Every structure is written in C-alpha cells, then in structure tokens.
Amino acid sequence: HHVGTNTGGVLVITDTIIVKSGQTYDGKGIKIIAQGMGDGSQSENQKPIFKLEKGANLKNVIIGAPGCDGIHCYGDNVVENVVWEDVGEDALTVKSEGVVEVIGGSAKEAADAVFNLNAPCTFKVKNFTATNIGKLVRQNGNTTFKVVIYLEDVTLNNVKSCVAKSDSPVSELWYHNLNVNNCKTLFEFPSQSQIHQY
C-alpha cells in the first residue's frame, strides 16, 4: 500500500471540480471538504463535488463531510479508490448513458441512496464496502429505461431499505461475491427474476 503523496492534506473547495473528457483527476490521497455547496442533508439542491464528463476518470480522493451531491458521472467513467466518509444526499449519480465503474474505496452514512442511476447505463461496483446506508443502488424512481448493475466483491453492513431498487422491468442486477449484514430486504425490483448471480 503506497499511501498517496497528498495524504494528510485537506483541500477546501468552493465549486464543483470539473474533470474533462479523457482526463484522470488523481487526488493522490487528498481529502476534500466542500464549502458553500451543500450540507449533506437530503435537500435536492446541492452541488456535486465532482462532475465527470463523458470519458473522464477520478481516483484516490477522500470526500469528507459535507458530501453535498457527491460525484456526477456523464458516462464512460472509472471512479477508483474513492472514499466517501459521509455520504451527502447521494454519493454518485449516473446522469447520462455509458459504462460507469466504481472500483475500490468505500462509503458510510448514506441517509438514503449511495448510487442513483438516472440514465440508461451499465453500472459496476467492484471491491467496495458500504456501511450504514438506506440503499446501495437506486434506479431513479418510476423510470423504465434499462440499467444493468453488477456488484462484484461488495460488502454491505446495516442497509435500512434494500441493497438495490428499480421500478424498471427490463433492468437487471447481477452479483458475484456479495456479502450483506443486517439488511431489511435485498432487492426491490418488479420481479425477483431480474436478479442474477454469476
């Protein structure tokens, strides 16, 4: 474990960090605290900490409270070793179509959803821990476009609502090495046959 070279620093920001297409923002272990961008409550008018344009990547940051509106992903994004110390309204939202992968890192203290999927996408969560959350993944309510979710080597503890919820019959969830402790229900999809192991 080579600790990142910005470890121990705290970057205080006052606007959304925009990562452009083809860029990788590498925080090298920096912790970010946002000011004037929200309080991390359930209010829907907060700003995202990061906006990842299509084809942009993000790695090696710790997002401190307040989590605001977390990370907005416009598709074809890799989000690697990001730690949400205290999720805000939500941790990450898929805002436009593409593949989005969350690999490594962890999330704690999500009052509602950790990941909100608001456009058709392929959404993978890999080597990830979350504790004290309402839901790990929510396809935006009452939408019927298709998402495909993969949960691979995911460990969850204290899930108040469910692991994942969608109102879309054509969406699917696939999981592989999923460990869940203390959860109300695992999956709230129209039918349980939308959920698969692999």
Ligand X SMILES: O=C(O)[C@H]1O[C@H](O[C@@H]2[C@H](O)[C@@H](O)[C@@H](O[C@@H]3[C@H](O)[C@@H](O)[C@@H](O)O[C@@H]3C(=O)O)O[C@@H]2C(=O)O)[C@H](O)[C@@H](O)[C@H]1O
Contact positions toward Ca ion, by CB under 5 A? 42, 69, 86-87, 89-90, 109, 112
Nearer to Ca ion, 4 or 62 (CB): 62
Least distance to ligand X from the beta carbon of 165, Å? 5
User: Which residues are registered as beta bridge partners of 152?
Assistant: 126, 176
> Rule CB under 6 A: which residues touch ligand X?
44, 89-90, 93, 112, 116, 118, 138, 140-141, 165
Report the partner that residue 86 touches, choosing among ligand X, Ca ion, none (CB closer than 5 to 8 A by kind): Ca ion
**Tokens representing residue 29 in the block:** 């272990």
Query: By beta-carbon distance, which residue lies closest to ligand X?
Result: 141
Could you tell which of ligand X, Ca ion, none binds residue 138, using a CB distance below 5 to 8 A set by kind?
ligand X
DSSP 194: G
Give, as one character, the DSSP assignment of residue 193: G
Provide the token pair at 134: 């309402």
The values of phi and psi at residue 193, to 5°, are -70, -5
Least CB distance to ligand X at residue 131 (A): 19
Tracing tokens 């620093």 back to the chain, one arrives at 9
Rounded to whole angstroms, how far apart are CA atoms 114 and 188? 15
State in angstroms the smallest separation of the CB of 3 from ligand X.
Answer: 33
Of residues 46 and 57, the one with the C-beta less far from ligand X = 46
Q: Taking CB within 5 to 8 Å according to partner kind, which of ligand X, Ca ion, none is near residue 141?
A: ligand X
CA distances from 65 to 31, 105, 156, 179 (A): 10, 16, 20, 26
Residue whose CB is less far from ligand X, 30 or 110 = 110
- Residue 116: phi and psi, rounded to 5, are -115, 130
